[PDB]
RNA sequence: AGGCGCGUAGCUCAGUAGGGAGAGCGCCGGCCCGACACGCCGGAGGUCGGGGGUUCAAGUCCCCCCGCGCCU
């Protein structure tokens, strides 16, 4: 009756899935081998899950997840988004780029009274902030987009590790759920 | 009758306006002069029309602009848009927030072998690199999703000088025109 | 009241464009203007327009042209075209692709008993085979799909030159109109 | 209560059916006797069909086939596509068609410069080169189109060795699985 | 699972042949295999009146009836699609270009014969006339009587005809094959 | 319907705990001879096949594309 769409910072994110192990491989066998006992469905976008098989490494894993779990793309042409999501996200993104500027001339002008000394420890401070500036706390992959067009077209509750795809979630008509609860609401039913 | 949306870029780039007179106000005077006797209709959002009045010195020229020209809004709330659209929009974000970041660690790499002095240069040099990189050939102001939608909107041809409005104008099927093909169409029309 | 969508043969093929003048590029002035005193409305794709004004050294008449023409790219996204039209396309496709590499094989044969000083006839007869027995009586450009789709949203007369394509365009239910008296229908609208 | 829709690559393919035994008729007989017991619901085009009993001598197996997968043919007449899927293929296959004539120009010169002698192997050559470059990673039939157009219409489990039909098939939507799981899937369902 | 029946099933010698070499014995066997296997078994009313015709059938009636199922399609609930008239049109058109040529050819061969071997004459044209206008495509109104009620039950048609199957196909019904009908039953 | 491997100077390759872009050869200067050469000083020689990603640092680690060969 239930639908529960999966993204991979479930598997990736380390404060969510201990709720099962303290493993990534104990914990997504832990997922594996008791939701077969839930009276839910279970869906994955197709790019995240090759995504989060790439980024872990399963052995005999696979093919039990795949039982468990219907990999599937949304249907991308009967979807219809609101004008003001392009807004505030055009606006968003407007303004996180001109962050994203003020850090790397802040570290271009840190870097440029070092003299050729550690400047491989500026580089890796700006890498850190840059990415933080631009890529948290938004939507910032098209495997986003795919969850998020999955959960709309689906009309299931949304599990998701992230900050921000879960604002956008919410922003357009998506139910959602703590991650720390799955192991709870998930095993009830 | 015909429906132009016109943008900043029409007054803003020169190579655009060349075609009324040299000097950017004497060129405005002629295009009003001209709008006052074409049997067609011109329309610019509000906020378009707020940055151009900020940024050009209309000063006596205001009246006229707004009587040939009708300033509107376009109306978000009945409006819906692609999903492949914002899918689209979203790869190309991340690909020019990537090619920013390594412009940025190529410039602070730079910046590292060149001491306290002439750093200045190198900020100039991030700066014209990184702007262009990421605001060159896409939508990035709120104020171009307004001349996209009141365009759409209102089945208008839509004038503009940039690039990147007509490529994502292109991809919603809006009739377009060449900027400097304007004044013999408002001769005739 | 009545729209005619345009194509790219109108002024290519000869014979198409001599109802209106011996040259090619005379032809399309007397097309621009008679259609600047015609009642009804034109329409040519955006792809189609790029290609046109590539293979045509369209000097001092392309304001004219976009005087009259209005040039537009179709809004897909939202067209459904039956599964006939693609089933009922793939096989066509297939049957021509084992068409080609008997050609190919048939021209290495045929190249490999003069052996010597004459490979480029044999070089030539394969270019034309392949090209009439891929490309001759079918859909092939993705500019062909552009105006199929623009005649059948806008429900207007197409007006091809193409073969491949008027056929093609039977099967969805355009009203096709033939090349050849545009210039009779033109002048009495 | 789950649905599959086989192709013939899944008893064609060696990596595919060494699943289930080192032998064609083996296979074939450990998935008809292992099919009996599983809770699924199996299918497969009547196109399809007629190919896969062209390729392999099936003795005393056609009954024990029939008694577990049920033949059906799609129900194309009410399935609509996207637009937007034609214009993929139509610039792929335009693509491919290219990237062939080339192959073929280029044997022809390779066979023009060799004599009568050791034609054949070049002809080979030309054969394996145009069949990987314009069969290889695209729908080439009409047997592959009614695998995908059943399982959009049965909403199912599409089960293909080919890599092609499964990269368009999830331009649609349509839940893909891994044909070397699909054994251990059987014994858990 | 449900199948659908056919006269061809109990007609055709190729297709009883799995029961028994005659028919009286295969209809009796499928009634005994058909009393234990578990499945539906649906035959159009206007089929079962040909079946009754055309074959003489007492003290088996009872049985058939009792393990076999009838009924006929809801035809004023059911719709078809329109590019079946078109296919059917061509088809139509063709095969009575096909028969008049065929009268004509039998007509000309006999005009040489003057009055002599006549007989033989019509009976080849009957022959000839049979295997080209009511083979390999549906005539009869109990065809369309088959495939309405399996479009509508989403049954097996199961029919040792071949045009039965070639319009089957056409509107996407599953399609057992007839020689088989006895192993499949007897594993149901 | 697929799986295995290779792409590094004028040619053929040695190249990895990621911390050089070189060599056996071809060979213009060189040594070497009264004398281009032999043993023997070395010029010159780059798309580490093309794009990206992770790192202070990539021929190396990770994905996509192109080309050349072996097994079904
Ligand atoms: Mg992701
Ligand atoms: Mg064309
Ligand atoms: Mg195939
Ligand atoms: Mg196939």
Redesign the interface.
């Known amino acids: 009756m239930d639908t529960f769409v999966l993204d991979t910072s479930v598997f990736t994110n380390p404060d969510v899935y201990h709720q099962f192990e303290e493993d990534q491989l104990g914990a997504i066998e832990n997922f594996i081998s008791l939701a077969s006992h839930t009276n839910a469905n279970f869906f994955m976008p197709?790019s995240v899950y090759y995504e989060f098989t790439k980024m872990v490494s399963l052995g005999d894993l696979?093919?039990?997840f795949?039982?468990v779990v219907?990999?599937?793309?949304?249907?991308?042409?009967g979807?219809?988004?609101?004008?003001?999501?392009?807004?505030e996200?055009?606006?968003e993104?407007?303004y996180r780029?001109n962050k994203?500027?003020r850090?790397?001339?802040e570290?271009?002008?840190e870097?440029?009274?070092?003299?050729?000394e550690e400047?491989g420890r500026?580089?890796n401070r700006?890498?850190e902030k840059?990415?933080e500036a631009?890529?948290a706390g938004i939507?910032?992959?098209?495997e986003?987009?795919d969850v998020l067009?999955l959960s709309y077209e689906l009309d299931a509750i949304l599990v998701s590790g992230d900050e921000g795809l879960r604002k956008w979630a919410d922003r357009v008509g998506i139910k959602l759920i703590d991650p720390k609860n799955l192991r709870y609401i998930m095993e009830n039913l």
């Open positions: 197709t696979a093919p039990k795949e039982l219907r990999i599937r793309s949304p249907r991308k042409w979807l219809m988004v609101p004008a003001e999501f392009l807004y996200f055009i606006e993104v407007r780029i994203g500027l850090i790397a001339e570290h271009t002008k870097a440029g009274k070092l003299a050729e400047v500026v580089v700006l890498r840059y990415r631009l890529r939507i910032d992959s098209k986003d987009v067009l």
